[PDB]
Amino acid sequence: ATRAIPELTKLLNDEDQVVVNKAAVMVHQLSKKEASRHAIMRSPQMVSAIVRTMQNTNDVETARCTAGTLHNLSHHREGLLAIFKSGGIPALVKMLGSPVDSVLFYAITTLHNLLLHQEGAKMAVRLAGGLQKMVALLNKTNVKFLAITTDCLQILAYGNQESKLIILASGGPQALVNIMRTYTYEKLLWTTSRVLKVLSVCSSNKPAIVEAGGMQALGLHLTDPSQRLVQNCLWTLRNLSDAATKQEGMEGLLGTLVQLLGSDDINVVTCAAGILSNLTCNNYKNKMMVCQVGGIEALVRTVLRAGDREDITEPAICALRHLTSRHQEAEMAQNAVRLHYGLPVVVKLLHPPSHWPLIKATVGLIRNLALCPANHAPLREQGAIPRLVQLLVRAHQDTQRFVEGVRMEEIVEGCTGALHILARDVHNRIVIRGLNTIPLFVQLLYSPIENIQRVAAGVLCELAQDKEAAEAIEAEGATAPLTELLHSRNEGVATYAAAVLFRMS
Known about the structure:
Blueprint: H1 5-14, H2 19-32, H3 34-40, H4 44-56, H5 64-73, H6 77-86, H7 88-94, H8 101-117, H9 121-127, H10 130-136, H11 143-157, H12 161-169, H13 172-182, H14 186-200, H15 205-211, H16 214-219, H17 227-240, H18 251-260, H19 266-279, H20 284-292, H21 295-306, H22 310-323, H23 330-339, H24 343-348, H25 356-369, H26 376-381, H27 384-400, H28 408-422, H29 426-434, H30 438-444, H31 450-463, H32 467-475, H33 479-484, H34 491-504
Helix pairs in contact: 1-2, 1-4, 2-3, 2-5, 4-5, 4-6, 4-7, 5-8, 8-11, 11-14, 13-14, 14-17, 17-19, 18-19, 19-22, 21-22, 22-25, 25-28, 27-28, 28-31, 30-31, 31-34
PDB class: structural protein
Keywords: beta-catenin, BCL9, structural protein
Assembly: monomeric
């Protein structure tokens, strides 16, 4: 039928008024036979007439039989090159607003095949305004059609901050979140989550996804048997979690993230620890629910199971730090870490091979645990004080003379802050004093960081309640800086500086 394609091509190619309607159904029958379909290609005027008529026609079948062809040329690598040369990409994009469901299914599948195998197709679809046409199609209800459309969006948006911003301006975030809450088709949910994953690293799309209820929507699929859907949801959840602190209705998501901590897959545990750490930051409501569902008990087991892997212990310690301070059941959480055999492993994380991010979080956790008087003794017997003193002395020497994303001033303030709370116990005060820490505490009063002066004067105020320590604080020449610290803009520095001065006299 090749020798015949030159006659057939001239026929439809002809066109005039209705001749066309019928002129197409025949190229559709010719596209159904592969031998004649191969001959349908290679003829530039033919393929260019199929697309040209497709956008001009207005009959009932309009695009169906013509797009029926390009659906079949899209199956051939030669046909994909033919549609690319015919300029069908801008016309196929025009059909993404067509009312007929048949052309919409044929146009989104042809563009999809072009986007996967035809070079330069991603850029041509963008120029035709395809991104906006595809986002507007996300209101359909055919899951097979929605799976093809979202995959085109992921192909176009990945590695393209321009496309991510266009999807945002088109209402993409809200439309993709709706698919998460509505459908159960795994292929559509997985692909939609891949689009949301690509969008979640964009600083402009992340809040919009959060506002659309994406955190709650992604949580609905954390129990799905499809590990690729749960893993993609967790990755997207961790990316958006820093901007979800004002979100409510998180009771179900927070409960599931606690269960996922017991999983055997490291990526699942690593994400769940990171999301819980971010959702509990400055959210006393989230601190309460996580504590109510046994979150302290689960996080201690996770830190115990992890050991050396800092990708798990650093967020899990950060979450444990949030849960043990500044909420109604924080006192129970500080006791819970002890009762679940957590105190030995927490002090262990202060020692090598721990890196500075994990050590910073572990010091902040020890400061919170020390608020519980039942933790004053076991933290001492585990050796928390001598190690915290060594970390403080070393970090102060580095200050006087950003190591892995941590400024040493934060280690100085954290270690002095933890020692300030531990100094409430009288036996800890003997250990702190025996390490000759007063000369450094006095030196820390001169620090430019007000928060360092606050914990320095506070720990000196706790020690000065014993006569031997108050006399030693005076001999260190601490009367001079504490006098200047009485005029501190910080209310805590001035009050602590007055407490040491009163005890010295």
